[PDB]
Amino acid sequence: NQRIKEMYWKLWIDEPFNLDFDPRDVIKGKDFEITAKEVYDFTHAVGNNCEDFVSRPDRTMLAPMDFAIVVGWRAIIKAIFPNTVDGDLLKLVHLSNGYKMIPGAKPLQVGDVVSTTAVIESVVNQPTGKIVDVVGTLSRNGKPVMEVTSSFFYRGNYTDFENTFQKTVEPVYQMHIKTSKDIAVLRSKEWFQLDDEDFDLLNKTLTFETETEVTFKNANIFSSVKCFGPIKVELPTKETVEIGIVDYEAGASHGNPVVDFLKRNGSTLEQKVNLENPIPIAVLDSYTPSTNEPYARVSGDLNPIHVSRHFASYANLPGTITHGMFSSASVRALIENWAADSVSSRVRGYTCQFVDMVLPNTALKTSIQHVGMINGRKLIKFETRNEDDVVVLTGEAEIEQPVTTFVFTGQGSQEQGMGMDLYKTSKAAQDVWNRADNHFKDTYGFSILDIVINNPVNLTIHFGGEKGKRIRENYSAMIFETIVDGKLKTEKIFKEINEHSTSYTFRSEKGLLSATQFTQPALTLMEKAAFEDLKSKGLIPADATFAGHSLGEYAALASLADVMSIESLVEVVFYRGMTMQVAVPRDELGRSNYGMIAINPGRVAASFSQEALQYVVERVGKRTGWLVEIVNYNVENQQYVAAGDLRALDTVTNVLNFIKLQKIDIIELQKSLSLEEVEGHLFEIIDEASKKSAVKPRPLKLERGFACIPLVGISVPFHSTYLMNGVKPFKSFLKKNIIKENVKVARLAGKYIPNLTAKPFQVTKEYFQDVYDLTGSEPIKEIIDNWEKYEQ
Amino acid sequence: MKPEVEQELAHILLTELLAYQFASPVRWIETQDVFLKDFNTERVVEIGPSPTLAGMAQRTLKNKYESYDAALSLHREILCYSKDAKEIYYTPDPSE
Amino acid sequence: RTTLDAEKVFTQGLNILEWLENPSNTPDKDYLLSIPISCPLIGVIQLAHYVVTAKLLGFTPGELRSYLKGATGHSQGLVTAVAIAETDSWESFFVSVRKAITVLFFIGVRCYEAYPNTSLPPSILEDSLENNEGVPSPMLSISNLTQEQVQDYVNKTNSHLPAGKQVEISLVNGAKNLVVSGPPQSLYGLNLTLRKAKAPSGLDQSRIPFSERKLKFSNRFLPVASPFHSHLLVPASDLINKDLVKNNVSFNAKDIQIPVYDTFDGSDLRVLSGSISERIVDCIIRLPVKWETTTQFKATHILDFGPGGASGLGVLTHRNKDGTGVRVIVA
Secondary structure, three states: OHHHHHHHHHHHOOOOOOOOOOOOOOEEEEEEEOOHHHHHHHHHHHOOOOHHHOOEOOEOOEOOHHHHHHHHHHHHHHOOOOOOOOOOHHHEEEEEEEEEEOOOOOOOEOOOEEEEEEEEEEEEEOOOEEEEEEEEEEEEOOEEEEEEEEEEEEEOOOOOHHHOEEEEEOOOEEEEEOOHHHHHHHHHOOOEEEOOOOOOOOOEEEEEOOEEEEEEOOOOOEEEEEEEEEEEEEOOOOOEEEEEEEEEEEOOEOOOHHHHHHHHHOEEOOOOEEEEEEEEEEEEEEEOOOOOHHHHHHHOOOOHHHOOHHHHHHOOOOOOOOOHHHHHHHHHHHHHHHOOOOOHHHEEEEOOEEOOOOOOOOEEEEEEEEEEEEOOEEEEEEEEEOOOOOEEEEEEEEEEOOOEEEEEOOOOOOOOOOOHHHHHHOHHHHHHHHHHHHHHHHHHOOOHHHHHHHOOOEEEEEOOHHHHHHHHHHHHOOEOOEEEOOEEEOOEOOOOOOOOOOEEEEEOOOOHHHOHHHHHHHHHHHHHHHHHHHHHOOOOOOOOEEEEOOOHHHHHHHHHHOOOOHHHHHHHHHHHHHHHHHOOOOOOOOOOOEEEEEEOHHHHOOOOOHHHHHHHHHHHHHHHOOOEEEEEEEEOOOEEEEEEEHHHHHHHHHHHHHHHHHOOOHHHHOOOOOOOOHHHHHHHHHHHHHOOOOOOOOOOOOOOEOOEEEOOOOOOOOOOHHHHHHHHHHHHHHHHHOOHHHOOHHHOOOOEOOOOOOOOOOOOHHHHHHHHHOOOOHHHHHHHHOOOOOOO | OOHHHHHHHHHHHHHHHHHHHOOOOEEHHHHHHHHHHHOOOOEEEEEOOOOHHHHHHHHHHHHHOHHHHHHOOOOOEEEEOOOOHHHHOOOOOOOO | OOOOOHHHOOOOOOOHHHHHHOHHHOOOHHHHHOHHHHHHHHHHHHHHHHHHHHHHHOOOHHHHHHOOOOEOOOOOHHHHHHHHHOOOOOOOHHHHHHHHHHHHHHHHHHHHHHOOOOOOOHHHHHHHHHOOOOOOOOEEEEEOOOHHHHHHHHHHHHHOOOHHHOOEEEEEEEOOEEEEEOOHHHHHHHHHHHHHHOOOOOOOOOOOOHHHOOOOOOEEEOOOOOOOOOHHHHHHHHHHHHHHHHOOOOOOHHHOOOOEEOOOOOOEOOOOOOOHHHHHHHHHHOOOEOHHHHOOOOOOEEEEOOOOHHHOHHHHHHHHHOOOOOEEEEO
16 A cells, blocks of 8 residues: 555655654644636536636636646545555545635635645545545635645545544524523533533524534544534524533543534524525537546646556556546536636536546536525536446536625505415414514513504504503603703604593594504515515525615515524614604694605606706795705616605696796706796796795695605605704614624625715715715714724 | 724724614615626625515616616516515425 | 746646547636637638638639638637638648748737636626526627617626726627626626616517617627636737748738728728738737728628528528628538
């Protein structure tokens, strides 16, 4: 075996022949500079014509994922050489090989200098031969880039169990701790070791992220068993956090009693989620080359069995078999082309089972399907057969979805029964709706589910008994936290509800589901529930951009950055809607002299621009002296929404009807006909519509006007300066209900697109500046001034 | 900048963005242009009960992205959770 | 054998005698069409048609070319045009043959190395196919639009692309017959802009006033592996000329016995004071073909030796000159 290894060592390893090193030890491979030439020779050898890997003017040349095996082979293969792993290398079999990109790492480029580390995870004596699982790690700029895994098999009969060891990374086990008995059982186990002895485990969800290292006495009995890893508790945000450690150690065992316990008493979390049915992608023909020399040159795999009849014949092979690692790269090239549409960057994982050997000049049918999802990556399965229809290569790949943006809908869209189909069918959705319903029932004495399902016209809350007084406190304790003259002051949202109130009643003309205080949480939940169901099927790309329209901003933030618990989200959005309801005098019955209209500048005249509408409205506002503003900029020269005084909406909606019937082209009778003096002609058309609307039914109805549609009787002037009163208190409330520790910068940075600053969220002085420029925020200003928070 | 401080600041930022959002206008024109032009989004998925933001995307595309999407051979897919469940969950019906 | 990294291009050899003997041993059409092998081999087809034409007329090559008022070629046909002009006896024919096919060979090898054709995203292929456009290639043909019309559409398409991915008008075959070269993906983005402006080909606007009808035009990709007459190939010009120096090939005006019409000017290549080899390369690699102005000579008959019989340059030229008393013969 030693003589054989000596020859193989001279072919594969450019180092002094020394078999006296520990399998346990890590193996360092020589630094490797990726170059244009090496990439070209490699891609030509494996037949990968992806454009990403070809020299093109003004675009840095990538290197195929596959190139990791060129960089890594010397380190990886050295792992099977030590004396303590004594194999006949002429009876060696490559079983499998995979690459997995580490998240956030960019793929290999032609510039890069890459080194490789390789450890040997497991060496076990199966009855049929000795299996060696190897794990490489390619690093560039002292950062991990991707993990290689390769599995080798020395066919034969092996007794040296003292040189056998196996490490396995267990699936994550989950447990809902319900009873004080459940917790007693856990404390029974020596291996259950909490950071804090007194930790309250009741009604918590623990996860157990566990590795188990084992050594062997013989085929059956383990000589030692180790099982360790963190114990985590789920928070309201769904974030898991370390609260302790599994620590099991044992000599002669027949089994691992930690995994046995977690299997029976817990559910195993699975990362891969199958589709309802596999989606076919393609069935493709490919050939093995007539000569294995080209691959051998670029790979460093001078294994004689691939090139020399006499060696192949000695090893009882059917011929000078094609390199396994060719088939790997060749089939992968197909997957890259057809499953990833030739965007190499999309394929972030590829695994490969060498089911049987293939000779040079074999024709390969390889079928590819979309089979499942995992963390927003399409799970692709494939199968490769030869002319005789024998399976030869199998494996799977993980492929990014095309670039995705999630947009979350605002008020106005809500409908009775919305989200309830999902509520029946989805565990994920049920948990969202229920967490929220329980929160509302226990703290405010109403069901958000009841309101969504039955949309009642009136709903009355009763303050009877010790449970009812606790609820009444929560209604009274709903305050405005303003800071006036240096000192803090308090203001009650619900003026009617005192120490002597037995009940409070919510009213609405047509149904409480369209009263904003209920509408907002209802809509938020519908969206968050839908999102969590999607996330549970692994359908959400890791690097998705997101934004929400008006209210949707809150749903979007919770859905993609879990910034707030379900309870916090609906609590905040409910308070928000209640703030909006107090700000509008409705002192006759359920109606105010405030509303909003949707305008289409296109319909007045094709020439009436955004500037035109912004100017026309700014003038009505200043001149008539009644507040009106553009609050939604939706679709350019097509959908804007203005809000304010119902009189000032009645001037605008008619003034536009006059400019339309006048049939005038803006650009012509702008600076050419009349320079600035146009303002004189504008005031003339404003004043003749202004005094027409300055005497009507005082809660005046708003009519349609060619361009302008009144929005389904919305009583509130959302996003107008009218609500600037409510910013200071609502801010103080947001600070109390969005805890700092729950803001993960990574999940917001360059993905969250706010409504204030239509610019991707960045924690940068430039951003804080832009915010201040549309805000005047005192807390923001003083942060800009001291941006020297770079110092500790 | 330390992680703890980056968070503390990101918090104050988020807080203020939402506080003022309440009573400032909604710049959905620029928002759309950020995710459509600057990010070249090929899948915009509306999470909502009705496809009203999807409707807006389709229009902003028809207006000022006719030649851009063509030239960059950039197939785009506008989906709403309520309308196109099958596309979003990758479950096409028994048609192959 | 002679040329340094030549075999790295000819991945399936160039054993053409074996291919003709045993059809079963011929590479796939993709290999055959890629310029390093198609450039020279098209040259061989033209040279062969010239021979059968001479031998059956009982002429030597020079005797035939004596009967010619002049000669020229479309794109890489220019090479076999100038090579024919020098031709004389059979004994001295294979020196002219050598000259031609060693130009065509280096044009192929260097222009491939400059812009080698990469994997086409299947989505793009499936779409172009279902819209009766071609299999995307680096050259795109457009019937029934003005040059200045086509140039608008490229300017628009080009406005969003960086330098490396821009497309340019390659050939001006006729009034309303153009070809555009660039990256196949960029030309797809052109075809997409184009699909919008065009009307269904069976729309029936027979009841719409002429003035208000919508444009009807063809635009299908051409069967070529490389983007001839475009900025993508410029790098090759310098290298190609150095290879012709090194393999003792040039064309001295003194030797070329008939006018050979420049592909961009219409001028005679003899009157040039530079290198002719260099201009012929430059006319194929970089400069457009103004076929109309190239073909500005007066003659009663024109012989298309060139590949493609009735799809060939012959019939195109006939359509340009119909009604002016010129007869084209597909040789």
